[PDB]
Protein backbone atom coordinates (compact mmCIF):
# COMPACT_ATOMS: atom_id res chain seq x y z
CA UNK A 1 0.00 0.00 0.00
CA UNK A 2 2.96 2.34 0.60
CA UNK A 3 5.06 0.90 -2.25
CA UNK A 4 5.00 -1.76 -4.99
CA UNK A 5 5.15 -5.57 -4.69
CA UNK A 6 6.04 -7.89 -7.60
CA UNK A 7 7.27 -4.71 -9.35
CA UNK A 8 10.65 -4.75 -7.59
CA UNK A 9 10.35 -8.54 -7.28
CA UNK A 10 11.13 -8.14 -10.97
CA UNK A 11 13.48 -5.21 -10.33
CA UNK A 12 15.74 -7.90 -8.82
CA UNK A 13 15.34 -10.49 -11.61
CA UNK A 14 19.00 -10.06 -12.77
CA UNK A 15 18.93 -6.71 -14.62
CA UNK A 16 20.73 -8.64 -17.40
CA UNK A 17 17.57 -10.05 -18.99
CA UNK A 18 15.54 -11.93 -16.35
CA UNK A 19 14.70 -8.40 -15.12
CA UNK A 20 12.81 -6.72 -18.00
CA UNK A 21 11.61 -10.28 -18.66
CA UNK A 22 9.90 -11.03 -15.35
CA UNK A 23 8.50 -7.53 -15.74
CA UNK A 24 7.10 -8.69 -19.09
CA UNK A 25 5.46 -11.61 -17.25
CA UNK A 26 3.58 -9.48 -14.68
CA UNK A 27 3.67 -6.38 -16.92
CA UNK A 28 1.66 -7.29 -20.03
CA UNK A 29 -1.84 -8.85 -19.89
CA UNK A 30 -2.01 -11.85 -17.54
CA UNK A 31 -1.56 -13.89 -20.74
CA UNK A 32 -0.38 -11.29 -23.29
CA UNK A 33 3.20 -12.57 -22.97
CA UNK A 34 2.98 -15.01 -20.03
CA UNK A 35 1.86 -17.39 -22.81
CA UNK A 36 3.65 -16.54 -26.09
CA UNK A 37 6.72 -16.60 -23.81
CA UNK A 38 5.78 -19.34 -21.28
CA UNK A 39 4.02 -21.52 -23.88
CA UNK A 40 5.48 -21.57 -27.41
CA UNK A 41 9.07 -21.49 -26.11
CA UNK A 42 11.70 -22.85 -28.53
CA UNK A 43 14.87 -23.23 -26.43
CA UNK A 44 13.78 -21.27 -23.33
CA UNK A 45 15.41 -17.91 -24.23
CA UNK A 46 15.27 -16.40 -20.73
CA UNK A 47 12.22 -14.20 -20.10
CA UNK A 48 10.04 -17.28 -20.35
CA UNK A 49 11.72 -19.13 -17.43
CA UNK A 50 12.38 -16.05 -15.28
CA UNK A 51 9.19 -14.37 -16.23
CA UNK A 52 7.31 -17.73 -16.09
CA UNK A 53 7.80 -18.13 -12.36
CA UNK A 54 7.51 -14.34 -12.01
CA UNK A 55 4.36 -14.14 -14.15
CA UNK A 56 2.70 -17.19 -12.60
CA UNK A 57 3.50 -15.89 -9.10
CA UNK A 58 2.18 -12.40 -9.99
CA UNK A 59 -1.09 -14.19 -10.78
CA UNK A 60 -1.21 -16.34 -7.65
CA UNK A 61 -0.93 -13.22 -5.45
CA UNK A 62 -2.26 -10.32 -7.60
CA UNK A 63 -5.52 -12.32 -7.75
CA UNK A 64 -5.82 -12.42 -3.94
CA UNK A 65 -2.41 -11.18 -2.71
CA UNK A 66 -2.65 -12.38 0.91
CA UNK A 67 -1.11 -15.85 1.33
CA UNK A 68 2.49 -16.89 0.57
CA UNK A 69 3.90 -16.01 -2.87
CA UNK A 70 5.96 -18.00 -5.41
CA UNK A 71 8.65 -16.29 -7.55
Amino acid sequence: MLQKKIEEIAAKYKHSVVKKCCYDGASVNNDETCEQRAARISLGPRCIKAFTECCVVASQLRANISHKDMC
Partner: peptide, 4 residues
Protein backbone atom coordinates in the same frame (compact mmCIF):
# COMPACT_ATOMS: atom_id res chain seq x y z
CA UNK B 1 12.23 -16.76 -11.96
CA UNK B 2 15.65 -15.22 -11.40
CA UNK B 3 18.18 -15.40 -14.26
CA UNK B 4 21.91 -15.31 -13.41
Amino acid sequence: CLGX
